[PDB]
Symmetry: D2
Subunit: 380 residues, 4 copies
């Protein structure tokens, strides 16, 4: 019914056989057949299907109001499976600032296979309409994006994609199914790095894909069985487990995000703050129209590299590590950690200043996180 | 020193920190950094590297006398990573009868990306030399093959590939590193479905790749990090564990294989038997030159479909399931289970008769397995 | 600092070696020694200590403001370890209505070893003072208790125990360290069935013990190493993981508990309601003095057995199963499931009527849980 | 049929529901009930029973030709459960040189509960008959024992126990069910530290108990459910897995043991060698009558402490660690590691000289292990 209930009771996450209230971990590769071709419960080889992976697929299908779910060994494995729906000569439109691993896969792997790619600022959807070529097959958007949290209108992207015969894809990692459901907005395929909020405990690398489209689902299933980037049963189980607390975690994170943003906007050592909840943020109205909460990723500007490093060292509760969506609050400097390969002046032009800090808000106490960052900002 | 010792002490499979005599299971996704860019032990994100996966990679590199190892979420994920070394327009030569999942990936996925593929009978290596096009980049061989155990000369394939500038790849699943080491024979890349003998307990779906080539290793690492078909830590641990008993298991299996083949050749209800140990087998001398033992996969002909099904039902210790390399002995009918999509007359032409039976010998008692199959054959 | 922060950053739950932000799972039994007796990090045999178990012990010590932690294979293993601090002829005072497994262990196992036991209504602490014999060594209390949630004054029990030289023990399962810390109130030893709220996901059977007493800790360590009821590394890891969300879960549960109690008190098909938050509840003031929140266990009276069974069948979000502290809301009938062995008239005398229902509130949406139970109560 | 077959197909280690050829890992604590008291498959709470633990219990019952199996969190947890069959005032006869953890539990824990214990040299069974008191309830023997491998006649111990109404128990760790089956010889209860050979990979701490006695089984079940020293599902699964290779491992170990003993007896730096295969060993005939193979534990005398330490440092394939039954060969000095608490002169009197070395033979190559130890012995 309501979301926190659906998180607990949605999907199949009990054992029909023994009644176990948690999904059994089928650490197995093959299955007995009573007669050639007669499978007791549909299973014959774990690559093709595994009952624990099936459980987590069922969960992500349910939570995104889709019909079919797919678990891959990582977010980029999910993304590659989706891109492999295309053929050489086909063309993809993506938002200009996609995740660096997505960019790296597309421009360094799939263009070698004849996939054509254009990166486009989708904060104006007419920019998509201009980018459409006769060969364009796919529209792939993240919203909001990293690390500047640019918002793209999901419903209009869906309409554009429908009118031009495009497979529409949304990378919904930053919002999770708890706050944003692209399938409800006409999108064909939604995916996630479950490594982030869904697993939620920094202990699983996984990707999840959902669709309501039977034919796209058949093609994704064939790709996943042929290229084999499948999530194992232990990790599927840990995903199912971590998703149970997703609503509580996201809501704690959102409370903290509101307070932290008030603090950041007030503080003199902080310049621009990037987050879709700020009403002056580009496409704020759009985000509130397609989502009923916020991501825990915030970026803000301190003065320079040394200010940023001092910030990191002076916090007690912000941890320096890769990834986002942990229980811990994480802190990073994109210009040094994710965009250090881009030349400095291009970084500056794009907004990736040396003092740009990205925090991923965790589930620590709101007051502690506000106070800790402030006292660290006070030391500049 | 000797192989059973190297299986126990080869690779890094203890914890340097605590002294744990088994590899810790790093069920983790990210790692603390003491300063931006300073990684305590080289780890920063589990997709890129994970210490348990690193352990199993170290093992497969050691066992194949390579320098670099790679663990993927399945055998076909390893194969796809290797194929993604190529670009559109490049061409691959494979043995005509490759594993059906390899064939399916190549002809249904990678040709859509402009990879050109020719399937060629490599039991005569000059057939490779004829198939070489100006665009040919890769030579990929299984030996022995499924389900008829056709043998390909690995060292000559390596020489051909060297002389023509081809990346040479051997799928070494059926023999394991215990009996056959393609890298020692000049091959550039060796891979395995670790789902089969290496894991050895029917409880892990995994692939493993080894190379001594620094530049090929860099490209494989980049592909694996960008497309993300990585083996998880729990499965890496179970692989490391199962590999410990590989020598003992393979040797039990080989003893059983010798006895079972004597029985099969003697029995009147059995016609042709396919296995490289039979001296009349094509390229028997070649196999004995490149290997010092045998695969546990045998195929043999009974009269028809009903004979085969009666065989399956009458055995007590042969289990009907997919996969091979279990502790259990497995039995299957290719014509119904792996080649049922091919038209019947093509099946017949290729040797896949309705009565062709494939067994994968397990580690049960030799006498029990010989006697059980015989009494089942006696009921025809 | 504040509790939700301490839950994330309290204890040692990262890897010092690799920087892994989660505790590695040391699925290992023994450890290399560089020289006889020189242990790299203190480990020599997993029964005696295991680094994953050490992590969870560190967590429970931190969360209870103790100094030493101990993980056992179940709550009753923890309880038995504590009771084995005593010698034959020694005497224990417990609250009259202890958990049935505690009662069963004490009266059916440990009295056969000469441990003397008296069950006493500790809601009046002077009742403890009367029960003190010259042989009395231990005072063991649960608060609040099952299934009627009787409250015992922890601080006065601590004072009594100090003055009479008793080892004081509190079973703190129902409240968790998040709401009640008996060690801060003078108690010598606190324990938990971590099977319930701490693990919190119905997927671990475990016990946890904490103390600040060095000498009691030495004796508990010796007992645990000699009788061997140790929690394994995988379960220790899952405990550490589940404890991260304990504050969020308990707080969601508490919000639901307040609303559900308002509903129950209003409903005509419900008679008495048992929960320490009700101001007419015996020792309500005491509970609010020793705790800053509430357990999720509520009991209430419907009319009879058939009413109770109809309730169970008519709910959509209350699940019929054993245990408490799940993410799911659980429902049970003590008179049939936990006290069916007691004669009916004794049941009635004790308050365990046929229509006594026990719910353990989960983390589903508050409104859904209130509405679901009401509409089920409406069908009576 | 034959033992290696029974190891693979004995017990229930597949999933009836999905056909999974390996036991699912029920990482769960509780089970749904369709109606109050109606359990779908007999499960209601994992402490009481868990389907993965049930699988391993089934295996150990099968392998010991018993009827009931029990998995505990460690060998000493199994031993304590068995001892808790007794009441205060009851008396136990054990062999004089029992495992130090058994001795420590009995004399430091259970005597505090009024259990009386006598340690007796059972290599002459009439020594048991003399030790029998009117209060004697249990006869507990290890054979062969640690570290001097003293052999006790199991069948005569069974007869004595029957005639005097004693519960007879054999700790069968060192021999495993593969070579010695005390239940077939009249013994009431057999147990194991599965930490050693059965798990076989140094990655599980576990105990296993088997019996054919329905009433003893009821009492063991009640004890295990009340005191709660249960083996978790992940460890139960790893036990089931490791037991598959037990025959192959034990047989490799036995081949190595024969060769290593020839070498040791020949070498001039080695004095006495203790192992039941040596024909001059006390009760050699008895051992060959009750077993059809050998333990992998050997002890032998070098000259002194410095010789022993030089031996340890000079080997390449003998690892210094606690425990036995690994895949690795392990080496230890009892006088320093397991008997360092006993005064020196008592050590000497008992045979625990400073130069007494204990090796546990692993599954490395036989020649490597013989040669490695010899060249290390050559450096003295
Ligand atoms: C309430 C509920 C739903 C409803 O899903 P919506 O499409 O969001 O209304 C789905 N699944 C479960 C298990 C529920 O309890
Ligand atoms: C003996 C030994 C080797 C030797 O490897 P080969 O190339 O086959 O000679 C390698 N690693 C370990 C651990 C060994 O013990
Ligand atoms: C704040 C904090 C504490 C403080 O504990 P209290 O005794 O409750 O004040 C302890 N540990 C950590 C990690 C903390 O962050
Ligand atoms: C052969 C066989 C047995 C026979 O057991 P024994 O008592 O040793 O003869 C038992 N179980 C299985 C599965 C077997 O295959
Ligand atoms: Na459900
Ligand atoms: Na649609
Ligand atoms: Na090693
Ligand atoms: Na080479
Ligand atoms: Na910490
Ligand atoms: Na105190
Ligand atoms: Na079986
Ligand atoms: Na008997």
């Amino acid at each position: 019914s309501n979301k926190k209930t659906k998180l607990i009771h949605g999907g199949h996450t009990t054992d029909d056989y023994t009644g176990a209230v948690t999904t059994p971990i089928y650490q197995t590769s093959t299955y007995l057949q009573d007669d050639i071709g007669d499978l007791r419960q549909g299973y014959e080889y774990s690559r093709t299907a595994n009952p624990t992976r099936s459980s987590v697929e069922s969960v992500i299908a349910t939570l995104e109001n889709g019909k079919h779910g797919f678990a891959f060994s990582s977010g980029v494995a999910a993304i590659s499976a989706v891109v492999m729906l295309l053929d050489k000569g086909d063309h993809i439109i993506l938002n200009s600032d996609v995740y660096g691993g997505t960019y790296r896969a597309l421009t360094k792997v799939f263009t070698r296979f004849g996939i054509e790619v254009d990166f486009v600022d989708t904060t104006h959807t007419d920019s998509i309409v201009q980018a459409i070529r006769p060969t364009t097959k796919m529209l792939f958007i993240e919203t909001p994006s990293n690390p500047l949290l640019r918002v793209t209108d999901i419903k209009k992207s869906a309409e554009i994609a429908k009118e031009h015969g495009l497979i529409s894809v949304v990378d919904n990692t930053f919002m999770t199914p708890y706050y944003q459901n692209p399938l409800d907005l006409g999108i064909d395929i939604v995916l996630h790095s479950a490594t982030k909020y869904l697993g939620g405990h920094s202990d699983v690398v996984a990707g999840l894909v959902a669709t309501s489209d039977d034919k796209l689902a058949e093609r994704l299933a064939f790709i996943s069985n042929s290229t084999g980037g499948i999530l194992g049963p232990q990790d599927s189980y840990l995903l199912v487990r971590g998703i149970k607390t997703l609503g509580l975690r996201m809501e704690q994170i959102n409370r903290s995000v509101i307070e932290i943003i008030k603090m950041l906007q007030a503080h003199p050592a902080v310049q621009q703050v990037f987050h879709p909840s700020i009403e002056s943020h580009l496409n704020h109205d759009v985000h509130m129209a397609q989502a009923d909460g916020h991501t825990g990723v915030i970026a803000f500007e301190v003065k320079n590299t040394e200010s940023a490093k001092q910030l990191i060292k002076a916090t007690s509760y912000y941890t320096l590590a890769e990834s986002l969506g942990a229980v811990e609050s994480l802190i990073s400097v994109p210009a040094l950690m994710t965009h250090a390969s881009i030349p400095a002046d291009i970084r500056a032009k794009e907004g990736i200043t040396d003092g740009l800090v990205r925090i991923s808000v965790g589930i620590e106490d709101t007051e502690d996180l506000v106070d800790d960052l402030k006292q660290a900002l006070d030391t500049l």
